[PDB]
Homo-oligomer: A and B are copies of this chain.
Amino acid sequence: ESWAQSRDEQNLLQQKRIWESPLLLAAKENNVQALYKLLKFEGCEVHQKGAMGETALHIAALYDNNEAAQVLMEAAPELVFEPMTSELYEGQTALHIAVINQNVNLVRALLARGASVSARATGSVFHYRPHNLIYYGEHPLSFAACVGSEEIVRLLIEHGADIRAQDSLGNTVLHILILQPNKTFACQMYNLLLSYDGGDHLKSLELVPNNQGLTPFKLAGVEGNIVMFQHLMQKRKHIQWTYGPLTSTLYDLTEIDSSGDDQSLLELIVTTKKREARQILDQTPVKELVSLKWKRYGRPYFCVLGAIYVLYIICFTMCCVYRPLKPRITNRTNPRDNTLLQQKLLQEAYVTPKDDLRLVGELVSIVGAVIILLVEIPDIFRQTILGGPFHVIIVTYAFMVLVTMVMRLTNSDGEVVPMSFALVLGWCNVMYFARGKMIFGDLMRFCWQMAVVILGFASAFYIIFQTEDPDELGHFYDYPMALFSTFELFLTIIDGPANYDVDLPFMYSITYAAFAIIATLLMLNLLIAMMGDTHWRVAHERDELWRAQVVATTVMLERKLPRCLWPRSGICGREYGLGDRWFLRVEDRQD
């Protein structure tokens, strides 16, 4: 406690040793006469290491002091090779400091001496950490590329600077240029480094991946660099023809799509916590890509799978609305007069008349729950909500159905507690399917969301009071009136089921508490959709997020669906003779 306090002390301790060491002070003050009155008479320790393990030349390189540095190099040419022996700057040479300060005469003189163009500055200051204001890499060639000094860049290549060099994070000089603030100027420097590549199709510098398996083009999309992305897109697009205003350009569509497997631009954009990366799926090679995946295949399968989940949940309630008998049997109704339980457990089953109709319905609710677990549980092993918490709810729903199964086969009294949780988890997970005029567009999402919530809480409130006596607190004595009570409940017109002389079950005081919060948030999410659609162009901000939600869902539907359905995007390039990648044909009009 802490680390920044140390370097703040060391930077003060550095200026303290510079103040003290006259050789280091004269190197800072550029006192030429004081350096000759020190190096020639009387011979002072010229290999003097300062507070940061720096030589007198390092100090002479920090402060642009060419006259003082040239004196230190002619009286002791060995100081050029000495790196910073400190921990904060372990590996930095006098060439690194001269390159960043863009001191061309000092760089030309250090290269004339013979300075190492491959020295890795592995100091803790040079790390890619949020507490370091700059991240340029380790090699001096990487420093020149980031300061925008094209003169030093080629001057280092002339002395044998390996552009293929990677730092401790496996980043080439191309990766580091994309992580820079000046995006519009780094595009110019990016093309300068590519010219010095081997010129061969194999072992390309643009193909050398990051240590996290990211080519520079791929890293531009994950980091949300629009300027570098559009620039890198030029190298991978081909214009077929120009018919007046139309321009039928053909995009490469290789590193932008599965598979893979985890390697694909789309999966990396929807799963990253970087908001800025959202904008990448709106670029002119990518926005055409997800819009076609959602028009065909995407939207129909989401509604086909949607209607299946609607039937699978209405069947679960069909077995809940007609749950198992019987009357109380027990005389316990006389003691503890606050109780209202006409408790109903089994079995006492089969017995079959109309009970096999619900047994096959209960069997569907079980085989569907494990199928839900058979497609989700093997997926958590390989987690970002963008995207909706549909997956978090779909696994806890099948968890409650299995618990209700284990609740059964034991004749437990608390049947109702796990079974009522699956009612809201089953329906409210339906409203996620609303992904399938903006005031009217967001209003229809409320009408969907609202009708979905009441069909999950009225079914719940029915079960909560299907056992309990309806003469007192009879808001839900049958299904058509449990729906109507809950509907009125949703708008606070009814005072809500309230009774204090009677002991209502533990689940009402819990389920109604959650119904009171969701009913207000949906009524609060409605006002923001009524005003936030008209008050400003924020409706665009209220819009892409949904669009990104649709894109996140479209990538989701492509992972588990087999290959016979959902054909690959684009057109393959084997016979016709483009190999072997799949290309997207895009034509655009200009005005």
Docked CA distance A496–B182 (Å): 61
Docked-complex contact A532 and B532, CB < 8 angstroms: no
Given contacts A491-B520, A532-B534, contact A475 B500 (CB under 8 A): yes
A243 at the interface (CB under 8 A from B): yes
Q: Which of B243, B474, B571 contacts A8 (CB 8 A)?
A: B571
Whether the pair A585, B246 counts as a contact (CB closer than 8 A) is no
Does A62 make an interface contact (CB < 8 A)? Answer: yes
List residues of A (99-123) whose CB comes within 8 Å of B's CBs: 100-102
Counting chain B CB atoms within 10 Å of each CB, the highest count among A12, A538, A578 belongs to: A12
The 8 Å CB contact of A101, one of B243, B296, B591, is B243
Q: Are A62 and B531 in contact (CB under 8 A)?
A: no
Q: Does A42 contact B (CB under 8 A)?
A: no
Contacts of A516 in B (CB 8 A): 487-488, 491, 493
Q: Which of B11, B12, B576 contacts A16 (CB 8 A)?
A: B576
* A513 CB within 8 Å of chain B: yes
A241 at the B interface (CB under 8 A): yes
A500 touches B8 (CB 8 A): no
In this complex, what residue of B is CB-closest to A524?
B530
Expressed in whole angstroms, the Cα–Cα distance for A571 and B15 within the complex equals 14
Cα–Cα distance between A228 and B182 once the two chains are bound (Å): 32
Residues of B within 8 A of A589 (CB): 133-134
Do the beta carbons of B19 and A585 come within 8 Å of each other? no
Judge whether A13 and B243 touch: CB under 8 Å.
no
Q: Check B100 against A243 for contact (C-beta < 8 Å).
A: yes
Interface check A587, CB cutoff 8 A: yes
Tell me which residues across on chain B come within 8 A of A2, comparing CB atoms.
296
Contact with B along A10-23 (1 / 0, CB 8 A): 01111110010000
Distance A501 CA – B491 CA, assembled complex (angstroms): 22
Q: Whole-angstrom distance from the CB of A299 to the nearest CB of chain B? A: 13
B576:A500 contact, CB within 8 angstroms: no
Known: A12-B585, A495-B493. A182 touches B19 (CB 8 A): no
Q: A512 to chain B: which residues have CB within 8 Å?
A: 488
* Complex-state Cα separation, A147 to B244, whole angstroms: 8
Q: A487 and B501 in contact (CB under 8 A), knowing A493-B496, A588-B133?
A: no
User: Which single member of B133, B509, B576 contacts A484 (CB below 8 Å)?
Assistant: B509
What residues of chain B lie closer than 8 Å to A530, measured between beta carbons?
524, 527-528
Residues of B within 8 A of A588 (CB): 133
Q: Are A181 and B244 in contact (CB under 8 A)?
A: no
The residue in chain B whose Cβ has the minimal distance to the Cβ of A526 is B524
Contacts of A243 in B (CB 8 A): 62, 97, 100-101
Interface presence of A9 (CB below 8 A): yes
B475 and A19: CB pair below 8 A? Answer: no
Instruction: Indicate if the CB atoms of A496 and B488 lie closer than 8 Å.
Output: yes
| A577 CA to B538 CA, complexed, in Å | 55
CA distance A586 to B167 in the complex (A): 28
8 Å CB interface, A442-495 against B? 470-471, 474-475, 477, 480-481, 484, 487-488, 491-495
Q: Are B100 and A241 in contact (CB under 8 A)?
A: no
Complex-state Cα separation, A7 to B585, whole angstroms = 9
Which residues on B sit within 8 Å (CB–CB) of A520? 491
Is the CB–CB distance between A500 and B481 below 8 Å? yes
A498 interface hit (Cβ, 8 Å): yes
The chain B residue sitting closest to A495, CB to CB, is B495
CB-CB < 8 A to A250: which residues of B?
12
> How close is A182's CB to chain B, nearest CB, in angstroms?
6
Nearest opposing residue in chain B for A515, CB measure: B493
Given A243-B62, A296-B1, A531-B528, A474-B491 contact (CB < 8 Å):
no
**Least CB distance, A531 to chain B, in whole angstroms:** 6
Q: Does A240 sit within 8 A of B, measured CB to CB?
A: yes
Q: Bound state CA distance, A102 and B244, in angstroms?
A: 8
Query: In the complex, what residue of chain B is closest to A532 when comparing beta carbons?
Result: B534
Which residues of B are found within 8 Å of A235, using beta-carbon distances?
Answer: none
**What 6 pairs across the A-B complex have the smallest Cβ distances?**
A474-B500, A8-B585, A100-B244, A16-B576, A133-B589, A493-B496
A and B contact pairs by CB, cutoff 8 A, 17 listed? A2-B296, A8-B571, A8-B585, A12-B250, A12-B571, A14-B240, A101-B243, A134-B244, A147-B244, A181-B591, A182-B591, A474-B501, A484-B513, A487-B513, A492-B493, A524-B530, A535-B535
Known A102-B244, A534-B535; further 19 A-B contacts with Cβ < 8 A: A11-B248, A11-B585, A12-B573, A12-B578, A62-B243, A100-B243, A133-B587, A471-B501, A474-B500, A474-B501, A487-B513, A488-B496, A492-B493, A493-B496, A494-B496, A494-B498, A527-B527, A528-B530, A528-B534
